[PDB]
Design a protein around this ligand. Structure first.
Ligand SMILES: *[C@@H]1O[C@H](CO)[C@@H](O[C@@H]2O[C@H](CO)[C@@H](O)[C@H](O)[C@H]2NC(C)=O)[C@H](O)[C@H]1NC(C)=O
Ligand SMILES: *[C@@H]1O[C@H](CO)[C@@H](O[C@@H]2O[C@H](CO)[C@@H](O)[C@H](O)[C@H]2NC(C)=O)[C@H](O)[C@H]1NC(C)=O
Ligand SMILES: *[C@@H]1O[C@H](CO)[C@@H](O[C@@H]2O[C@H](CO)[C@@H](O)[C@H](O)[C@H]2NC(C)=O)[C@H](O)[C@H]1NC(C)=O
Ligand SMILES: *[C@@H]1O[C@H](CO)[C@@H](O[C@@H]2O[C@H](CO)[C@@H](O)[C@H](O)[C@H]2NC(C)=O)[C@H](O)[C@H]1NC(C)=O
Ligand SMILES: *[C@@H]1O[C@H](CO)[C@@H](O[C@@H]2O[C@H](CO)[C@@H](O)[C@H](O)[C@H]2NC(C)=O)[C@H](O)[C@H]1NC(C)=O
Ligand SMILES: *[C@@H]1O[C@H](CO)[C@@H](O[C@@H]2O[C@H](CO)[C@@H](O)[C@H](O)[C@H]2NC(C)=O)[C@H](O)[C@H]1NC(C)=O
Ligand SMILES: *[C@@H]1O[C@H](CO)[C@@H](O[C@@H]2O[C@H](CO)[C@@H](O)[C@H](O)[C@H]2NC(C)=O)[C@H](O)[C@H]1NC(C)=O
Ligand SMILES: *[C@@H]1O[C@H](CO)[C@@H](O)[C@H](O)[C@H]1NC(C)=O
Lengths: 270, 197, 133, 50, 35
């Protein structure tokens, strides 16, 4: 209607569609928040890495948080955030419940817990364990005797460090490695944009603006014209809502998979 | 004592009831015609315009019914996903012992029992949780007679004066023997090896 | 004044508790009067890492927890020609010229109902014999 | 002849000497030029929300 | 009502209780072997 009393009066006899639409959108938003919280809030306490770092020669400087930056994010996280890049007409965007700083804190807690205590912290209270012995356990878990690790410690540490550096460089230089997230952003933006663009259509009436129809005709057929515009815009809005529902279901499936992977591969060995 | 622990089943029931209520209440809308009851329209005027009014009613009611059916399809898909997950859980955590962490219960899984609920299932998971920790000094291997000894299962610990081998998940010290350790190489390349007997 | 908007009728405190009623942008409110605050992500501890120290348990506990999962919903059925016509010959004749928008709906609903039965059957019928204690 | 509601502010956009008004995208007017003073203004929709 | 009907499920709740009883007795007595 866009602030037209006649439009509102005509719309009054169409039932209670607005309750349905707003209810669907509210369900979607609540589900989004539950998705994020379910994936990331896997721990009860916020662990901290010790100031002195001698992890048997392994080097984690690229993934541990950097206090120098205000973001309190690591190097790789900054690269990722700089890689992907992006209240008007009765439509609004609501902020998420968890800020990015909180997500960073959760990630840091998980990293510190797994570096310091192995897989114990995921099943009770974190138990300290020197890192090399943890790697020995992890080799022993795949059928290679721990004997092998201790006699090849330096070589293994060097390989790990080189691999980390390589992944850093590959991510920094090559683009189009994050197609999925960019795709999601683009899809949302495009759907909203076309929904707005649909306002300029005619739907078989004489004009696309209510003011001209009101100011150039008497009520008896002005009602018909507004009725045509009303039904057209209502149909477009319904289409938008249904598409949103489908996309939300798909995203929920993906988030469930992500939570399972985090639980089974970060908190333990698979 | 505590209620409101069964939120999910209640939510399912409430959503279904709400959808039915709005569908049935949509029957009282004019949709631009002169009335909302078809008998009075029939009883008040001639056919040639009765068709006009009935067309308005028909198109409105068709739209409402289609919306209802589509919502039902979406909800059914979601429920089927949940049911498949439940079937997997009962196959894996009831008919056997599961190793994948945190799949059923928090801790180390032992077993599970099923119970029925009006539109779903309830699993009781039994888990083992360690407690009452203690701190010790540890080494990766033992040098003895110029050879390096590693433990078969367990880990070397010391209470300050003597060394023992224990299983990883329960304190149970034992004397280091040639039966619970194996030998490989000489104590030259291992970082942190210690001298003992 | 918050990043989510403006709020009236509640008091802002400097503490940080567990979240009761989400508001957004990292803040939420609870009843004490009504107070608004910043969420607390949990406790805070620093595990005592060192390169020659280990921690081993000496006791255990046995815990039992619940998990609740829905498996089915009610099976419903709807009739077109009674819903939108209500036993009127004229309404039926007028509706006839819309093709088949009522075979489709009935097929969809029946498919849903059969799916519900299949869901229950595959969740519960996992054994061939009825064992007795 | 260009009608609309909103709040008007001073803007630093530079209209090339023959344009009258500007729009950003999706055909929504953003700036105008007053026919008397010949200066560029800016239009912002009046605030709303749930 | 106006054409809206509810159909009963195929498996009555007694049968579902019987299935759960069977599963639980089997897991108590034989362990995981009966699976
Ligand atoms: C862990 O790796 C990082 C690589 O990021 C090392 O930091 C680099 O060290 C070299 C040599 O001092 C410098 O030339 C680079 O400028 C450093 N990079 C950054 C980003 O600071 C770090 O030294 C390694 N850790 C240890 C203990 O050597
Ligand atoms: C084992 O000994 C260490 C060191 O003695 C204990 O470390 C304590 O750690 C907390 C948290 O960092 C400090 O507040 C204490 O002061 C430390 N105790 C000291 C330095 O004596 C550790 O708690 C002990 N127990 C276990 C299970 O590790
Ligand atoms: C570490 O454990 C050993 C063995 O449990 C302790 O040695 C024993 O100590 C008791 C206490 O007097 C003596 O009766 C035994 O004869 C000792 N055993 C041997 C083989 O000498 C040792 O005291 C413990 N150390 C600490 C610091 O508690
Ligand atoms: C474990 O950590 C300790 C202390 O951080 C290391 O002890 C250092 O060893 C070097 C080489 O012998 C000495 O120069 C330092 O003075 C020692 N530190 C202290 C505080 O005395 C030890 O090397 C590390 N590795 C082990 C024990 O395998
Ligand atoms: C473990 O024992 C061996 C021999 O009992 C020690 O090796 C001696 O080390 C000293 C000092 O480095 C040398 O002067 C001797 O020549 C070494 N003897 C032999 C036979 O190699 C070794 O240092 C001991 N380990 C520790 C940590 O004290
Ligand atoms: C392990 O924990 C259990 C319970 O947490 C301890 O058993 C308790 O022991 C105290 C004192 O002996 C009794 O008053 C309690 O009644 C016991 N609990 C139960 C459930 O029987 C047990 O002692 C602990 N193990 C060790 C070695 O201390
Ligand atoms: C319309 O006429 C008025 C009246 O002269 C013009 O306003 C003058 O503009 C000049 C240019 O800066 C100023 O020096 C005068 O002080 C202004 N006087 C008044 C009374 O406003 C205005 O510019 C004209 N607008 C046009 C021609 O578009
Ligand atoms: C505490 O809260 C008051 C008012 O809510 C605020 O002015 C103050 O800056 C906060 N912090 C401290 C340290 O007082």
């Amino acid at each position: 209607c866009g602030d037209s009393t006649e439009c509102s009066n005509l719309l009054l006899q169409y039932g209670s569609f607005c309750t349905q639409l707003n209810r669907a959108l509210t369900g979607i938003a609540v589900e989004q928040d539950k998705n994020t919280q379910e994936v990331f809030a896997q721990v009860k306490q916020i662990y901290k890495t010790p100031p002195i770092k001698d992890f048997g020669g392994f080097n984690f400087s690229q993934i541990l948080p950097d206090p120098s930056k205000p973001s309190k994010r690591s190097f790789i996280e900054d690269l990722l955030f700089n890689k992907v890049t992006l209240k008007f007409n009765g439509l609004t965007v609501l902020p998420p419940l968890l800020t990015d700083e909180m997500i960073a804190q959760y990630t840091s807690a998980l990293l510190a817990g797994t570096i310091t205590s192995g897989w114990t912290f995921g099943a009770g209270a974190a138990l300290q364990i020197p890192f090399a012995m943890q790697m020995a356990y992890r080799f022993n878990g795949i059928g290679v005797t721990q004997n092998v690790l201790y006699e090849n410690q330096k070589l293994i540490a060097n390989q790990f460090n080189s691999a980390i550096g390589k992944i850093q460089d590959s991510l920094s230089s090559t683009a189009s490695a994050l197609g999925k997230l960019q795709n999601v952003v683009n899809q949302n933006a495009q759907a909203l944009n076309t929904l707005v663009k649909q306002l300029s259509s005619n739907f078989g009436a004489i004009s696309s603006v209510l003011n001209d129809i009101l100011s150039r005709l008497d009520p008896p057929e002005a009602e018909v014209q507004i009725d045509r515009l009303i039904t057209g815009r209502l149909q477009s809005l319904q289409t938008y809502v249904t598409q949103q529902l489908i996309r939300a279901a798909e995203i929920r499936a993906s988030a469930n998979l992500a939570a399972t992977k985090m639980s089974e591969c970060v908190l333990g060995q698979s | 004592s505590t209620a409101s622990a069964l939120g999910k089943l209640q939510n399912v029931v409430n959503q279904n009831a709400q959808a039915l209520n709005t569908l049935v209440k949509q029957l009282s809308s004019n949709f631009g015609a002169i009335s909302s009851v078809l008998n009075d329209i029939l009883s008040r005027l001639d056919p040639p315009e009765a068709e006009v009014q009935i067309d308005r009613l028909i198109t409105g009611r068709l739209q409402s019914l289609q919306t209802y059916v589509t919502q039902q399809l979406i909800r059914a898909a979601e429920i089927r996903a949940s049911a498949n997950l439940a079937a997997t859980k009962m196959s894996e955590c009831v008919l056997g012992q599961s190793k994948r962490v945190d799949f059923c219960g928090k801790g180390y899984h032992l077993m599970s029992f099923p119970q029925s609920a009006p539109h779903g299932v309830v699993f009781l998971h039994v888990t083992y949780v360690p407690a009452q920790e203690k701190n010790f000094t540890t080494a990766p291997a033992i040098c003895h007679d110029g050879k390096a000894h590693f433990p078969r299962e367990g880990v070397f610990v010391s209470n300050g004066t003597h060394w023992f081998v224990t299983q990883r998940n329960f304190y149970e010290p034992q004397i280091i023997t040639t039966d619970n350790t194996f030998v490989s190489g000489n104590c030259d390349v291992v970082i942190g090896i210690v001298n003992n007997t | 004044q918050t990043r989510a908007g403006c709020l009236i009728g509640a008091e802002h405190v400097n503490n940080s508790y567990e979240c009761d009623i989400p508001i957004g942008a990292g803040i939420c409110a609870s009843y004490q009067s009504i107070i608004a605050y910043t969420m607390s992500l949990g406790a805070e501890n620093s595990v005592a890492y060192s390169n020659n120290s280990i921690a081993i348990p000496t006791n255990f506990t046995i815990s039992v927890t619940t998990e609740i999962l829905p498996v089915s919903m009610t099976k419903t059925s709807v009739d077109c020609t009674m819903y939108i016509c209500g036993d009127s010959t004229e309404c039926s004749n007028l509706l006839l010229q819309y093709g088949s928008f009522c075979t489709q709906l009935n097929r969809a609903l029946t498919g849903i109902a059969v799916e519900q039965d299949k869901n229950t059957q595959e969740v519960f019928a996992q054994v061939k014999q009825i064992y007795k204690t | 002849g260009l009608t609309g509601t909103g709040v008007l502010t001073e803007s630093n956009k530079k209209f090339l000497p023959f344009q009258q008004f500007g729009r950003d995208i999706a055909d929504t007017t953003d700036a105008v030029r007053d026919p008397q003073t010949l200066e560029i203004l800016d239009i912002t929709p009046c605030s709303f929300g749930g």
